Enzyme design. Sequence first.
Site, short mmCIF file in Angstrom:
data_model
loop_
_atom_site.label_atom_id
_atom_site.label_comp_id
_atom_site.label_asym_id
_atom_site.label_seq_id
_atom_site.Cartn_x
_atom_site.Cartn_y
_atom_site.Cartn_z
N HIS A 43 0.81 -1.23 0.00
CA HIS A 43 0.00 0.00 0.00
C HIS A 43 0.84 1.28 0.00
O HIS A 43 0.30 2.39 -0.12
CB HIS A 43 -1.02 0.00 1.14
N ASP A 99 -0.12 -7.64 2.16
CA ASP A 99 0.40 -6.28 2.03
C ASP A 99 1.92 -6.33 1.98
O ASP A 99 2.61 -6.00 2.96
CB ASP A 99 -0.09 -5.43 3.20
N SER A 196 4.67 2.27 7.73
CA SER A 196 4.43 1.15 6.82
C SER A 196 5.62 0.82 5.93
O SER A 196 6.37 1.70 5.52
CB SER A 196 3.18 1.36 5.98
#
Lengths: 250, 28
Positions: A43, A99, A196
């Site tokens: 993402h 992810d 992230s």
Amino acid sequence: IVEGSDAEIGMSPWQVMLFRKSPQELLCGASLISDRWVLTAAHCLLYPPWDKNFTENDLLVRIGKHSRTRYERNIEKISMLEKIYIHPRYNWRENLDRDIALMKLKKPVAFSDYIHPVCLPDRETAASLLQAGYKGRVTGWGNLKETPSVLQVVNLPIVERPVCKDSTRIRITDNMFCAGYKPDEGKRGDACEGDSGGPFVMKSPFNNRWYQMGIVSWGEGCDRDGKYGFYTHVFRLKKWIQKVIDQFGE
Amino acid sequence: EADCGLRPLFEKKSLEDKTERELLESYI
């Protein structure tokens, strides 16, 4: 990184900064697994609602950094991206299942005191270490609160699956694990927006090497009581990682 | 890759980092 502390110099030499070329903006964290390959969350590269659908020449990686903003002359190394790899069954529309993304560097980096790769876990290590109550380490330049000058470090216990599932309404997958302190444990800490792609690492008491068990993926807020940060299960998807990396000649 | 997970400023120097022990002690 919420409720943590400053990293020591060389504490996380596999730490990679994912950086946008135009405009100059810190985009995500990432991990260095070889002189050539960088591991991150998908993402960071592909999340269309936030206008995230980057091609190779849109991004660069900054490896060996400590400071968030300051350029480090003979310390950090900047490399372009040759090829972006996102998991075939990555699910951005629902729960960020799988992810995970790999990045091939145009310019391979030389290892130094500030640059060094993290190990990917073999099956036994993942079984021996990825267990509830066992603490791992998260690093990042992400938000200090919901609302840093240097890299941030927090140690968090792996949380058992029933508690991860009950804490949220978002669908939990076996390609995920959650981590963080329970409200009745007193201590606190969490990853946050900007963290992230960052590694969730664990040190093996058997060969005292560092293994990356997770990738900062998602969460609801940051460091909230009864809530836990969710991480991409690296080993569960190591079958995809193997296929991508072992494809080309050295 | 063959020398992965060993930090030049820590494991290769035989130096314990600030919060390294928190991880080791959680394996009980």
